[PDB]
Amino acid sequence: MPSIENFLAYDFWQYDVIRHLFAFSTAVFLAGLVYFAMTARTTAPNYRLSANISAVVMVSAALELGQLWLLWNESFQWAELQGSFVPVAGERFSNGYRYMNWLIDVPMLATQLVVVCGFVGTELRNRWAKLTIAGVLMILTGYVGQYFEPAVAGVPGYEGAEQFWIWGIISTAFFVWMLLILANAVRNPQGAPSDEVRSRLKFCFWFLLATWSIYPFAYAMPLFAPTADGVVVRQVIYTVADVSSKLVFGVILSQVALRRSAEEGFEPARVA
Ligand SMILES: CCCCCCCCCCCCCCCCCCCC
Numbered sequence: 328m329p330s331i332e333n334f335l336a337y338d339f340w341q342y343d344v345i346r347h348l349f350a351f352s353t354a355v356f357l358a359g360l361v362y363f364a365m366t367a368r369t370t371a372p373n374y375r376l377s378a379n380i381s382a383v384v385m386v387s388a389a390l391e392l393g394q395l396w397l398l399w400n401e402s403f404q405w406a407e408l409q410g411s412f413v414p415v416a417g418e419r420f421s422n423g424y425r426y427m428n429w430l431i432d433v434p435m436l437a438t439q440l441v442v443v444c445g446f447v448g449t450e451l452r453n454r455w456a457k458l459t460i461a462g463v464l465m466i467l468t469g470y471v472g473q474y475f476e477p478a479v480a481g482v483p484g485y486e487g488a489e490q491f492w493i494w495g496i497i498s499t500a501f502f503v504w505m506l507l508i509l510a511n512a513v514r515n516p517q518g519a520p521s522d523e524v525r526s527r528l529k530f531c532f533w534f535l536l537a538t539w540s541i542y543p544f545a546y547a548m549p550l551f552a553p554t555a556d557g558v559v560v561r562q563v564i565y566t567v568a569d570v571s572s573k574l575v576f577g578v579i580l581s582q583v584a585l586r587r588s589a590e591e592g593f594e595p596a597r598v599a
């Protein structure tokens with residue numbers, strides 16, 4: 328299961344930029360941990376779970392991008408005569424590795440939105456269950472599709488390009504199911520939210536839809552049969568997706584949770 332990244336040589340700048348993307352992302356998610364810990368204390372008990380879920384996603388994402396940093400360093404070797412980083416035999420890098428921790432990220436990011444919508448008990452657990460089923464199936468089917476991206480990129484000797492489309496389209500169907508669950512949640516918030524909260528919950532849904540939509544775009548980059556430069560672009564695309572979907576979304580959602588907390592008379596949330 329080699330990703331397109333494995334079949335290319337990288338000049339120092341290309342290799343070093345991608346290395347810094349993984350490292351910077353890891354650092355930013357760890358820093359996010361501090362923000363969510365602090366915000367949790369100023370959030371009403373009934374919405375505090377959302378800040379706690381953001382912390383879980385920060386740790387998941389730090390290990391995700393940390394593994395990519397390690398695999399990137401291990402999978403390529405400096406060739407002095409070429410003045411490039413070249414693929415090491417037996418050591419394979421794949422974006423595919425990031426799919427494992429999506430099994431945490433995807434259901435949790437979706438569920439925390441449902442929490443701030445004000446769903447509790449069975450109503451929350453029914454939605455969490457459906458988002459987890461849809462999310463796991465989305466990721467597992469997507470994983471099968473990306474397995475064949477070399478054939479899609481026209482890497483000599485590689486077949487099964489049709490699998491990329493078959494499983495890609497299956498995954499997209501599961502994505503749409505998650506979006507419809509979440510659309511229903513933000514349209515039907517619990518309690519008596521202000522018009523401002525109603526509007527901000529809808530903003531959070533569309534922000535999730537926008538940032539999540541970057542992942543199928545990154546999945547599709549092998550269609551563009553990229554050079555080392557195209558791979559730099561792809562890993563920048565993933566970095567924008569990761570930081571925006573996990574940390575920026577988390578911060579925006581935490582601020583809606585603070586507003587709901589304040590509206591419901593939680594003093595520490597009003598003071599903040
Ligand atoms: C106002 C509240 C007090 C401030 C709390 C800020 C503390 C920082 C956040 C706590 C997280 C620490 C847990 C460490 C585990 C990190 C996992 C490492 C993954 C590589």
Ligand SMILES: CCCCCCCCCCCCCCCCCCCC
Binds near residue numbers: 530571575579
């Ligand atoms: C190449 C490095 C990329 C770093 C990640 C870039 C992060 C992009 C942030 C996009 C979203 C910005 C905030 C959106 C506006 C939210 C304001 C509150 C609601 C109006």
